[PDB]
Amino acid sequence: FNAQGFTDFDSLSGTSTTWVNELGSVMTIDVDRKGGVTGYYVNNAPGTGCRGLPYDLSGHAHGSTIAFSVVWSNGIADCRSATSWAGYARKTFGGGVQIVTQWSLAFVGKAGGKIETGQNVFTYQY
Amino acid sequence: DFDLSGTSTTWVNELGSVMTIDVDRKGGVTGYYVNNAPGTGCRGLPYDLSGHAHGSTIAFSVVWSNGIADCRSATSWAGYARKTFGGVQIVTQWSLAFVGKAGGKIETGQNVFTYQA
Ligand SMILES: O=C(O)CCCC[C@@H]1SC[C@@H]2NC(=O)N[C@@H]21
């Protein structure tokens, strides 16, 4: 792969790439030829659980847009939580690459079922 | 409750969208989404869906391109299982990503899926 060449999420078709957000959480995504997204997310987000373990990641990317989800369970830690990202590619004028996302986090607290929301921007890294 | 492994299940939301999901051994989710939301594109044909369920939580993703019709957008839902009075409900927040005349926008809202056997 090359960030120079990056056109849209088609530029990933058949590539392995690592992406860090502003919280230092890292996803390592395998994009297949037909736009299927598999790999692992590492939460390193302060203030939150299940940090620094691999969590299975599945989604799809087409054109400028991408959606993917994690359930926070692998048989090691369970945070009783699932997270979903939808977003679009952004090409930096510096010739790097970004994914701008809204994430939804669903969990069941002492107060029962609840749904927290926010933004992550992931920057391509090697 | 989402701990479904071995079988398909059919869910329908307040917008009258249908999804049918296969939950593997791990808690992985494949299947198709069928949208019929008032005022949206890509209504009535199926789109691939991927995600994961475990315990009282699930998350799944649909890109709206199936080789037939493309609305150049993607949705992810995250949700929690609410027990009603046999069929479990999935209460969810969805984010919808599209690039338009005002570039990348990301709209949000809530969906309740209802089970059917
Ligand atoms: O604490 C939990 O309930 C489980 C881990 C949550 C990590 C969240 S997902 C939203 C945000 N983005 C990240 O990369 N980390 C946090």
Ligand SMILES: O=C(O)CCCC[C@@H]1SC[C@@H]2NC(=O)N[C@@H]21
């Ligand atoms: O209009 C588009 O960009 C493609 C179809 C999107 C359908 C949305 S996804 C959120 C909401 N929930 C549904 O079941 N349908 C709409």
